[PDB]
Design a protein around this ligand. Structure first.
Ligand SMILES: [Cl-]
Lengths: 367, 350
């Protein structure tokens, strides 16, 4: 029944010859630069672990730490602080160059190695029995930034990754401030990279990225800015100008940001969250706002392949970009469903309904 | 009906996965359920024992001399270990066939350890490495056995697939039109039917083994089902491989049950009559089928193991061999425990 559809029915679905294979629940929030909710899928206020989608907020805490500007981190360095990188040799090299700028060493890192987020990098590692170490962590840039912050204020580097350290105190305050939430409304776990990681309603993730894009807009216009807005503009610029540092070759975040050529930034969170900050454009205006836009997505069951398909479909439905811009992501949008003999056996479809002509008696129960 | 398995990071919900499950008696009557026990579901590799039945029921196939390990391979989603490839080639030799006659393709190994070995050695898997290579060799065997020709053995209009289609519905006790069909990863037709009927197949496998073991006047079909159960339980390493859930499950239970994975996170178990099954209020064998709605295998194995615990199937000791699947490790790159898995669902009885 098309006239009683509900958020509980917002799915991305795979089929095999028309027969349902898997289905995945979708949550999404589209917010303006003050966080007002414009469009939604599923439960746009789902309490959600941001994971690496929080990294631009953590980078802001680092950049607002007094004395860090003296280290001479450049834009590509800041993009690495914002990264879940593929552990390509260029990311490892930049991590070592950042350690040298702050006079630290790999032994000071409290993140650990892991299989590369790139299958092609990981294939090279397997061929040489290479065991990844702390410096190959996808989060290595954030960790060097955190060491830099710790050294800059005289706190000392041991323990920089623990909640009681002033660097983590700065992070926690900064996250809650960008979300416009009280401390008690942000929850904290421990991340795979061994730092505190926040959880907050999904729409507030979109709000953070709308603030990133809004600051970029104010910077490009030559508006006076607070030190925080200037730094947010710097983070947006770094990510958009060095998207290979934020992920790597063949990675969704890198291909998405290169396709849009400065119009937006986007960032993955583990277990299938995504956030995009969209600069003010004709597209955003047609969606009903005068400023920048934020988009946040969570696939309830954590499937990454579905996340990238859904994010790309959502950009298409919001009219963000052109068909030629978004066609660079066609392989993510409609993932291949081909068997071991080259036969196409199925595909992906998007039975969700953006909400933002319905009878007023149709309840939209966030689910 | 709102039955989930949930992972958390420090008590904070990370992911949740919808679970469907059917526990049936030997005649398929529903005894316990999670979610939607009649969910229309692609059985994928969990259908392979029924495809093995079609092969073994083909006239002339017994003349090839397949043994219980070969039949176990027909029923398998093997890890493509060297020993699976070797048995595949041995089975081709028994029917005087060539790897070039197989119509399945190579794929990255279902064992990441095997796959890593392949990567290190620049190995490109071919048809004989397919996890379903035993099924395809059996299909070639049945095609040759009735003189139908190996050409096109995997196509729906070939009599071997006609036999498979008919056998799947007969075992489900469904009319042909109630089973839907697509194309599998291994390039054969693959069936979809309500989830509880997958449990029904496996209860019939275990029931047949109980009847064989009991000296009961069986048809040739029940005798073949009994043989299929015996081959899987005696050679579980062929059905999956070292470290695989199916192999470890069947080894732990030492003949009391067979279990089989289906791609995109289905699972089927046939349980022979036991103190545990009588405790569940049935005087015969039992079948269990499970589907994780979003396709996550890690959650599948954890749920199945929890389900065996809730049903009292096995002893705590026997199930503890599966502890690493039951509560998956949730540790970060520095050895800190960051989370865990919870099972807020409740079995509903009849
Ligand atoms: Cl260094």
């Amino acid at each position: 029944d098309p006239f009683t559809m509900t958020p509980s029915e917002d799915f991305v679905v795979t089929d095999r010859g028309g027969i349902v294979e898997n289905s995945h629940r979708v949550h999404a929030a589209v917010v303006d630069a003050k966080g007002r909710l414009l469009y939604a899928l599923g439960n746009p206020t789902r309490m959600t672990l941001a994971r690496s989608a929080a990294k631009p907020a953590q980078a802001l805490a680092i950049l607002e730490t007094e004395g860090v500007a003296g280290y001479g981190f450049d834009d590509a360095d800041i993009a690495l602080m914002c990264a879940s990188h593929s552990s390509e040799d260029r990311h490892i090299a930049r991590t070592r160059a950042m350690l040298s700028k702050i006079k630290a060493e790999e032994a000071d890192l409290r993140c650990g190695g892991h299989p590369s987020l790139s299958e092609m990098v990981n294939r090279s590692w397997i061929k040489q029995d290479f065991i990844p170490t702390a410096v190959c962590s996808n989060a290595s840039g954030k960790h060097v930034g955190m060491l830099a912050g710790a050294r800059a204020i005289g706190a000392g580097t041991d323990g920089y990754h623990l909640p009681d350290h002033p660097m983590q105190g700065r992070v926690k305050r900064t996250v809650a401030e960008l979300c416009d939430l009280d401390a008690g409304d942000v929850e904290w776990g421990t991340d795979g990279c061994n730092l505190p990681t926040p959880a907050f309603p999904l729409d507030r993730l979109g709000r953070i990225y709308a603030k990133l894009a809004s600051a970029a807009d104010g910077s490009d216009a030559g508006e006076g800015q607070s030190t925080r807005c200037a730094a947010l503009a710097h983070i947006f610029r770094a990510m958009a100008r060095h998207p290979e540092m934020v992920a790597g070759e063949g990675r969704y975040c890198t291909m998405l940001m290169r396709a849009f050529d400065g119009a937006l930034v986007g960032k993955l969170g583990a277990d299938a969250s995504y956030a995009i900050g969209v600069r003010a454009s004709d597209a955003t205006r047609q969606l009903g706002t005068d400023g920048a836009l934020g988009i946040s997505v969570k696939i309830e069951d954590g499937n990454l392949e579905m996340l990238y398909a859904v994010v790309t479909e959502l950009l298409e439905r919001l009219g963000i970009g052109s068909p030629d811009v978004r066609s660079q992501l066609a392989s993510f949008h409609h993932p291949q469903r081909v068997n071991t003999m080259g036969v196409t056996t199925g595909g992906v479809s998007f039975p969700f309904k953006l909400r933002g002509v319905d009878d007023p008696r149709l309840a939209a129960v966030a689910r």
